[PDB]
RNA sequence: AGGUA
């Protein structure tokens, strides 16, 4: 996995360090970023109601 | 706002009129279990002090 | 998803949600809805054994009120052999199995509200309209033959609003494509109406107004409330024996 | 919006009582026939009972004595 | 068999006892409500009260009659809003676990409005609720009668619930994320920008800090006045310089007069919080209690954000 | 007391990709600047975007025509992405008008005088059959933010055409913003940052009138604070 | 197009110390916009006046005890950093504070000048017991922009002085506190608006409505050239 | 019946 993200010219920790949004100020230490891959379940808010 | 039908509609009744209380009555659920238990070769009243 | 096992590609294909060619061949035609492939010359019977059609499921009503569709993945002029995916099923592309969608994540508090467990997501995700699922829900309405009298489905309902008679036909079906919303009246179904109990304020009124008791009550199929949406596909049911209307 | 009845209790020690007590002001409150006694911010008659105790102005005493009061200028 | 029922008898307790102005939904975090209010979707809101904007509409004249009320609540027009916006006001609504082992499983918060469909929850309640935010439903109960408002607000009130029954240590304790953002701000490292200053007040250690001229956790010296409750019931004002760090001053900010600084002046875990906001309570009251741990919640959030703790694969 | 920034060169490595800078800035001010101007681009930039399509053939989304090898809701999906420019007109209909086999993109589409398309290549759609013909009225009107057909459908209620299909528009022209606060050195004033802004934009908007706009909004909100009512 | 502008800003202040100020409505996300950028203006760079540089006539160390004075010298110097001094004349102005007798040693000891305002009449500056009964320095207050800590300053000063000038972290900023807060608000049935509350504790030098608007004035100055 | 806590 390391040497695949030293390949694609990235942080071989996986983790990058983060500006906020709000204050637009980095977060101290880095934080672990990447794509996952999520799902959405059929649990619905809408139907829950 | 579960069993006294007469309970529900007056306090329907209270609530769009603006006005908050309540008549604690009796729950049907209450009547059904007298009648039911009455089915049975079994007495069971009301009795007042 | 980007980080696989393996198995998407077997479990897509397995599965019959994917349209896979049987024969292999040159595509000949490509369509939303039908793929025609031009057998290869040593996988044709002998005589004309022709072309191999794929008609393409397209918004069908799961078991789980969610839609089921099959896109081309391919497209004219490209060889495919047996076992090649042709088309693409739901949660499925390219011929890999494809619930969910990759997102980047970042792991980190960020001022409560990611708490317990729960997700932070930005806009982005809706604006790029990504896990937006297309939910096709069921209605039924039945004109059933009542002792009262036998039901029936017209446009002219009694005391409704016109905004309900104009998204029927003549016919009283709402129009295939029309957009409707809870409460909104779909079939213009009525039940002839029985004997009526009128209390004396209801005598009264009626007296004054001129007004008298509708002999048939409506019963028209409504939208429940709290949901939305387009009627994409309407189905009419009459058994045989039974006079047809012009819908059907 | 009363965020804690904890200066209710301090004047109704029961905690019990304290609710019948201000549910008759408030019911007083709501229902025709009384007039406020601490001005609101749009409020209805609960956070009212809850600040009229608060104050002191309310409780069993002053509901029960005032009942009389208005109980004899009726009857006159 | 129809009286012989489990659990209990059916119609009567369970199953069921179906109850009326009841709604139900899933429940996300409310990281910005106060204790002792809860989010309410709109629509529930609009749904569950459709009796009190009917006799609002009436009152202020807006619909001749329930029907014509009926008719503008399901336009939904926004001349309703407003009036829903008053009934919510002042009414408290019942929350309500799907399990029940406790008599925290039900708690009043007032509801606020929100946009959107799921209930939010304030996140200190939901250790009471033993609810985690993935996917767990809870129901939400009107109290109509005037004393059963009443009866909400003084019995079944969080802000009146902050101690278990069971034991009288509280139960709103901070648990997770706040703990690990008050850790964080507390825990003094060896060496960081700004350390040997001399500051008075945290007001200057939470400049410094915002600035970026100091790190968050590093030893300084702090003049600071703390208050110790002593002779009758009287605060002591007693203003001497401590040795601490940034984020332990910036959290004494928070802390209400009358406690000890050396509550502050340490490693906090979640022993550490749950015995401080205890002392809290003790010595101040109830007022002070809730307004300091909605207080350490929100401090908490806002730097456990600012920490960026987040777990690697080289961690 | 200040030294005032100052527009200086504004580079294109790419026709979506432009690097702003801001060379006289005070130390200190680099990440409020910033990050003021970052938020004010995603936030409250006016762009050009598609809300209604009105596709003859078809009378909803979730239909399909002849010889299209895409779904009509994959038209409209593609559509969303479509970047255009319009300067006369607040609200304009393009019409598309196609036949014949082969990948109808956004170059296809009618242009007018006003109407500038940014990304002729953008492909709408595949026609694979001889005689298949799509036209198609394509509505682009002017707005900021994000507004998603399920908005202004509750304010139109039901729109009395059903041969026409709204889509949510992403009125947001651009897509990434960054910025690199640097020492900027100078020989006046020893103490100086330069502010590097690197947009993504769909190529709607210039980033010159970006940042122009993104000022404007950020006085008119400073309005408020100069002048206080008490 | 069509843009949303805050209206009915409300105030409640304490003093001329502490205020909160809340603005509404304002649109998603210019709460947050509007809050960092006041803070960061308020708190990084305002200009100001503040002490640097102190005397001790007894020991020239900064950590050192005082003869005749019951408070050590790191103390002392710390108390001058809350001292809130307003100058309207030239930028580096000396102040002799000399005074003899028990008691405590507040800002109203030292001389007034026709240039210096005392904001603080009353403030404790230091302590004086028997043994010396006497305490006497010069202090430099000068005009600056934002916080400089001592520690800072020696670093950006090479020009060396005799020991007894003790450096002190100066405050040039008038505000001792500033925090934003955004909640959510609601206008029409619209509810993605925002309060913006701005919690402010200044030092008497200026009042905080002033400091903010002042503020604001700054960041709009810095604005204009971008704008046509 | 399956699924959720």
Redesign the pocket.
Known sequence: IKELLKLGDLPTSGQIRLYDGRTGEQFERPVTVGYMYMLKL??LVDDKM | KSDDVNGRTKMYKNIVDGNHQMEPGMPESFNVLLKEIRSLGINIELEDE | PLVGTGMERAVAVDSGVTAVAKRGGVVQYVDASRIVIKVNEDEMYPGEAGIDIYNLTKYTRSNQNTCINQMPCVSLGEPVERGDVLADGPSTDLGELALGQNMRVAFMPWNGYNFEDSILVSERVVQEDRFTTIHIQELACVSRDTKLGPEEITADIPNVGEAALSKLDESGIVYIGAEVTGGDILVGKVTPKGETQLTPEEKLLRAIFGEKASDVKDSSLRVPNGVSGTVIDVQVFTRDGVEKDKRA | ARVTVQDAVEKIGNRFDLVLVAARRARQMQVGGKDPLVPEENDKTTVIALREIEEGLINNQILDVRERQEQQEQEA | DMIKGKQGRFRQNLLGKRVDYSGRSVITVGPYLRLHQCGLPKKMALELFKPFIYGKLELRGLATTIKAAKKMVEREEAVVWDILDEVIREHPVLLNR??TLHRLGIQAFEPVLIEGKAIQLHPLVCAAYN??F????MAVHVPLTLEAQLEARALMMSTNNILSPANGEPIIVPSQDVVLGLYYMTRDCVNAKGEGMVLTGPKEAERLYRSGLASLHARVKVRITEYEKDANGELVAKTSLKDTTVGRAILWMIVPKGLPYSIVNQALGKKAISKMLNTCYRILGLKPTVIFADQIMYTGFAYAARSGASVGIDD | EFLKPRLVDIEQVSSTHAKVTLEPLERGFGHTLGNALRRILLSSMPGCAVTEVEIDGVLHEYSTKEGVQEDILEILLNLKGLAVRVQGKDEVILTLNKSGIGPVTAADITHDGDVEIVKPQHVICHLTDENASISMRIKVQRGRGYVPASTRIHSEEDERPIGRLLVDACYSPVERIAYNVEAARVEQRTDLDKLVIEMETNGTIDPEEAIRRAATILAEQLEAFVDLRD
């Open positions: 059929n649990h | 799907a399990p609810a985690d993935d996917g767990d439903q």
